[PDB]
Amino acid sequence: MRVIFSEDHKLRNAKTELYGGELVPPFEAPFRAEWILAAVKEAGFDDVVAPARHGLETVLKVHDAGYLNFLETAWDRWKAAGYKGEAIATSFPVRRTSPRIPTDIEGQIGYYCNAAETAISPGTWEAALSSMASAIDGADLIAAGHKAAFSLCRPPGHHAGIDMFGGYCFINNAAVAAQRLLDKGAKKIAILDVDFHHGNGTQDIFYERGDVFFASLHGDPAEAFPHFLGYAEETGKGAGAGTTANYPMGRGTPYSVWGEALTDSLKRIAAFGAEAIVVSLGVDTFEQDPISFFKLTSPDYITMGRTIAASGVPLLVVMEGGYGVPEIGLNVANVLKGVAG
Amino acid sequence: MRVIFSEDHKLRNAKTELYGGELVPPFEAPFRAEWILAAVKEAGFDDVVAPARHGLETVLKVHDAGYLNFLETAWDRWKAAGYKGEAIATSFPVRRTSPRIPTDIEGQIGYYCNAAETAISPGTWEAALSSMASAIDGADLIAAGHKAAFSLCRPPGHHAGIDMFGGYCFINNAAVAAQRLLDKGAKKIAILDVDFHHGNGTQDIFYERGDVFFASLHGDPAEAFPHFLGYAEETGKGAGAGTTANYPMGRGTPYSVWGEALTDSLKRIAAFGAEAIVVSLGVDTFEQDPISFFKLTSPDYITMGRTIAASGVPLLVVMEGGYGVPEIGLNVANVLKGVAG
Numbered sequence A, B: 001m002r003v004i005f006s007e008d009h010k011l012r013n014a015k016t017e018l019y020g021g022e023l024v025p026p027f028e029a030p031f032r033a034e035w036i037l038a039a040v041k042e043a044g045f046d047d048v049v050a051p052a053r054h055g056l057e058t059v060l061k062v063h064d065a066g067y068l069n070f071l072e073t074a075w076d077r078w079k080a081a082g083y084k085g086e087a088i089a090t091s092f093p094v095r096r097t098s099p100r101i102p103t104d105i106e107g108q109i110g111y112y113c114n115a116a117e118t119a120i121s122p123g124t125w126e127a128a129l130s131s132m133a134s135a136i137d138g139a140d141l142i143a144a145g146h147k148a149a150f151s152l153c154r155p156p157g158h159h160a161g162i163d164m165f166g167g168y169c170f171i172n173n174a175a176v177a178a179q180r181l182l183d184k185g186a187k188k189i190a191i192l193d194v195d196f197h198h199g200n201g202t203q204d205i206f207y208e209r210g211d212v213f214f215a216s217l218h219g220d221p222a223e224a225f226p227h228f229l230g231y232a233e234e235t236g237k238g239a240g241a242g243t244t245a246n247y248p249m250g251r252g253t254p255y256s257v258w259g260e261a262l263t264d265s266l267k268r269i270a271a272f273g274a275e276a277i278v279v280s281l282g283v284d285t286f287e288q289d290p291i292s293f294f295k296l297t298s299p300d301y302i303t304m305g306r307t308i309a310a311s312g313v314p315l316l317v318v319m320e321g322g323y324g325v326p327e328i329g330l331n332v333a334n335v336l337k338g339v340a341g
């Protein structure tokens, strides 16, 4: 399958991340894309191409315009306000607060943020756009007829909601990809999030959209980031009622249990009538990944790819999370091998 | 007038605070209490007594029980979780999120927080209780017959809402004082927040209570912390409709304009029928205060105190904000001089 990758991902190179009450070098670093890229190439998937230029038409259909406008000038405004560090939100519009939008940079950054550990830095906008382009090109290959494609997105995006960034996500690549497929002719598309974390941003985007189905397997939000979304009770709302299926799971969850969830989600995706499936691929479910509590092994990733590919519809794999462990690329490549069959 | 002060305020001595994208030394440092205390004594207010031990009965009437329970052991759980820094929240329950409460410390700290710049450190809980005690004792003096009293509270409290901490506040001292006056015999009490910042936590607590009136003068939330509450349109809800009066003002606001809002707030308090007024005093409205954009002078604090005392009802002054400048104590003493007459 073709691999879409942009070098401009390196423009996203934040210096800080709030973790454990300290500012440390971000875990979502440029080297992640490098090792994943090297591994997939070694696995044989060497047909790597750079993404083409794309406007904001597609993304404007899933993200709020105010939010996108905010991301584009966030850094300049922050720097212009005279702050020394990177752009990090501290005030948030939580329970029983006003719905009004602040006018200054200090207020807006919190208004448009769901997780403060994520800092905005120089190049973030440009990088997010290149990652969005990689997703769009991936979707076009699918529309063109390809059975599968791999968009090596970075930064990731399943935590970026309609009008907020967080979890190292600014633009929901998977959402944009899904939207692109619909613009190319599809009437029904599904997004399958296998990343350890709940794709709260993807769910938020399509919660009231009846033309897109969203299924996610993840650590129980009661004890895992993003903490405030991902519960089984959330099945959709209004025009999108019934199009969300969450599968929260506890600590030590082996592939034996994780696999049942995967099977059930594919069954719901089939009953929905998806013409294609966008897979938000995160390999942080790996037993050796320190940021998760699931127990998946390297071989299980081959099984994952095969199971999803057996849906019988075209697949677009979009890179999401995964700690920078020596086996990150290996696991990603294992998923592509499973898909290739 | 008697001054209620606790030495245990020093138990709250956080090492870090998130500002401008960096972790800098907290602005709400112990020296503020020292400087203020020395100044009031210097001004003749040398009758300083420590607060007696009090239970949680009063505070449990304005704050959520789960919230208080969370505070008592927040630090322990944080450290026990293996983190190196201070307890700082990163994930927040913002727009379109689940109302469920996470079970782990990582998720609960965000659930119970509205501002990430405030870190929970060793002794924060104990310090907050001592500060609450000072407010309660100050309230007892007023209930006994004193025409005025001053609770040198630290940490401050007007940003602490029903079930959330932030803005360097954990327990809402003013709210607790007002509740105490009600339990002593008052049927109606008013809280006047003259601190530069909107008392969002105090407003949140009494928004639906018809027995307490809340008036606040502050920097427009459109461009000032807490950013998400404090708009003139917020006048109350349900059982408490009509009991909130916000007076947001712009940059460069001098006493010429500020005093006009004060007069009106007092007029509404009188119409409400308050039997006493709890004054949330913050001297961060001073022209040389770095965190605010108002321009009050040291002498204006004497006028302010006099105008408030002219209400004709007992007054309990509770310390809130005001940072940096050594004139912090001078300004607080001036307010007390105006009140004392």
Ligand SMILES: CN(C)c1ccc(C(=O)NCCCCCCC(=O)NO)cc1
Residues within 6 Å of the ligand: A019, A027, A117, A167, A168, A195, A196, A197, A225, A282, A284, A290, A291, A292, A320, A321, A322
């Ligand atoms: C052991 N170790 C080094 C870590 C453990 C947990 C976190 C974390 O929860 N971080 C919160 C930020 C959310 C992460 C989102 C990235 C992702 O995988 N999305 O799907 C970080 C580091």
Ligand SMILES: CN(C)c1ccc(C(=O)NCCCCCCC(=O)NO)cc1
Residues within 6 Å of the ligand: B019, B027, B117, B167, B168, B195, B196, B197, B225, B282, B284, B290, B291, B292, B320, B321, B322
């Ligand atoms: C120039 N300088 C040193 C500063 C300027 C602004 C802030 C701030 O907005 N901080 C946000 C945290 C809220 C502060 C609440 C304290 C208060 O006065 N409450 O009423 C901080 C420092």
Ligand SMILES: [K+]
Residues within 6 Å of the ligand: A193, A194, A195, A196, A197, A198, A199, A216, A217, A218
């Ligand atoms: K997921």
Ligand SMILES: [K+]
Residues within 6 Å of the ligand: A284, A285, A286, A287, A288, A289, A290, A291, A292, A293, A294, A295
């Ligand atoms: K793991």
Ligand SMILES: [K+]
Residues within 6 Å of the ligand: B193, B194, B195, B196, B197, B198, B199, B216, B217, B218
């Ligand atoms: K105020």
Ligand code: NA
Residues within 6 Å of the ligand: A206, A207, A208, A209, A210, A211, A212, A213, A214, A236, A240, A243, A244
């Ligand atoms: Na949907």
Ligand code: NA
Residues within 6 Å of the ligand: B206, B207, B208, B209, B210, B211, B212, B213, B214, B236, B240, B243, B244
């Ligand atoms: Na009220």
Ligand SMILES: [Zn+2]
Residues within 6 Å of the ligand: A195, A196, A197, A282, A284, A320, A321, A322
């Ligand atoms: Zn993840």
Ligand SMILES: [Zn+2]
Residues within 6 Å of the ligand: B195, B196, B197, B282, B284, B320, B321, B322
């Ligand atoms: Zn203040």
